[PDB]
């Protein structure tokens, strides 16, 4: 099925620029117009720009009119979004879409690319939450992982390199001051832990931080 991978994003100092990309695959890129839609944190989708396959027609939202430039590389199956004079109002998750908004498969990692308009990167500190008390569920025991003090978002978190996917809740990051804290809880059978080694894998791309923290007995 059609796949579409957004991939520019990152921290940008206000006034700063960025150039996003969207690798289209699964269909004849050259025959379709494309869109760039964005979505602010506590706001809904917003259309950004449009470009015909011949790049002969180009539409831009009043908001980004004059600072963003849409382009595409037909023989390279790629869409681009050149951002410039980046306002904090530009801080949002960016998604590219086929002209007919055909529901497309994304990247193994997710959908869209986040770009924050702000200040300073900071690496998170990953801490393993073991029970001692860590109040199970029943004959099931829950374990956690706390990623605190980081900037900017996102942080990727998995359990046992992704093998452990059932029972995990990753609560969304919460910005306090100008740093984020995120946590994930995973529920296994009383029989799994501590026997089967459970690890918390955290990745904060924005700082090349990658840590694996094994949850061990105590609390």
């Amino acid at each position: 099925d059609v796949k579409l991978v957004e991939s520019g994003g990152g921290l940008v100092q206000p006034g700063g620029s960025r150039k996003l990309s969207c690798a289209a695959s699964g269909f004849t890129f050259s025959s379709f117009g494309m869109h760039w839609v964005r979505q602010a944190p506590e706001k809904g989708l917003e259309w950004v720009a449009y470009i015909s396959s011949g790049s002969s027609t180009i539409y831009y939202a009043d908001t980004v009119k004059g600072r963003f430039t849409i382009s595409r590389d037909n023989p390279k199956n790629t869409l681009f979004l050149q951002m410039t004079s980046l306002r904090s109002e530009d801080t949002a998750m960016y998604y590219c879409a086929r002209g007919d908004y055909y529901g497309s498969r994304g990247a193994y990692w997710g959908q869209g690319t986040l770009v924050t308009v702000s200040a300073k990167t900071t690496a998170p500190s990953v801490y393993p939450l073991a029970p001692v008390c860590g109040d199970t569920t029943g004959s099931s025991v829950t374990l956690g992982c706390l990623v605190k003090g980081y900037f900017p978002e996102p942080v990727t978190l998995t359990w046992n390199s992704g093998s452990l996917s059932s029972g995990v809740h990753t609560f969304p990051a919460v910005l306090q001051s100008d740093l984020y804290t995120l946590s994930s809880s995973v529920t296994v059978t009383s029989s799994t832990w501590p026997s089967q080694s459970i690890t918390c894998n955290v990745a904060h791309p924005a700082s090349s931080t990658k840590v694996d923290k094994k949850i061990e007995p105590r609390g």
């Binding site: 809904g44 998750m93 908004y101 959908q111 008390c133 829950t142 956690g144 969304p172 306090q176 809880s185």
Partner: protein
């Protein structure tokens, strides 16, 4: 640059129910209006174009209609697979505009949270900090109240809560409450309590631990 007015901003509906989302344009658009659904994974997917023409593969239980100014999406019979955010789009005028959107929450049976508390790790402690975490898992409704109590007294400062969006698989929510103190405050109190109050119970769900004795 036509303004699209969408309603309702949000709603909870039991499966099997009928849902009607409505979109109004600030000026004529002659039926050039689409209804897309943004799935929980970010995926945007058009359902209807030209106001009432379904895209292929789109389930017959979705249908659009126009009533004067009103553009209406109707979902006769909510399926669990229809858990998403719906937006309407006008593609009549050169600067395309979306509707405010509608956050759909699937109504469900009461579910009491499964409360668990976690004392500060040794790593954090050596760092001079102490974060006590409490996970209130798989409950419904979303409304829940968490209190932190150091020794007897209820602490309000330093709590950082975060909710989970409705689980697309079991229609429940989860919460994560964190109290953060310095290692010196932590080290000089004993019991650390996290008590949650939810519709499913009369008495608070309480979880605690006394530090002391490494």
């Amino acid at each position: 640059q036509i303004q699209m007015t969408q309603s309702p901003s949000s709603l909870s509906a039991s499966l099997g129910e009928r849902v009607s989302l409505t979109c109004r344009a600030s000026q004529e658009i002659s039926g050039y209006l689409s209804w897309l659904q943004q799935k929980p994974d970010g995926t945007i997917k058009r359902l209807i174009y030209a106001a009432s023409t379904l895209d292929s593969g789109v389930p017959k239980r979705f249908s659009g209609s126009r009533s004067g100014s009103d553009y209406s999406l109707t979902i006769s019979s909510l399926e669990s697979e229809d858990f998403a955010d719906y937006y309407c789009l006008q593609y009549a005028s050169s600067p395309y505009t979306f509707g405010g959107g509608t956050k759909l929450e699937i109504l469900r049976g009461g579910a009491a949270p499964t409360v668990s508390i976690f004392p500060p790790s040794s790593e954090q402690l050596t760092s001079g900090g102490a974060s006590v975490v409490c996970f209130l898992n798989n409950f419904y409704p979303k409304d829940i109240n968490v209190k932190w109590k150091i020794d007897g007294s209820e602490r309000q400062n330093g709590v950082l809560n975060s909710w989970t969006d409705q689980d697309s698989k079991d229609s429940t929510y989860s919460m994560s409450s964190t109290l953060t103190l310095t290692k010196d405050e932590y080290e000089r109190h004993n019991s650390y309590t996290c008590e949650a109050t939810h519709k499913t119970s009369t008495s608070p769900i309480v979880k605690s631990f006394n530090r002391n004795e490494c």
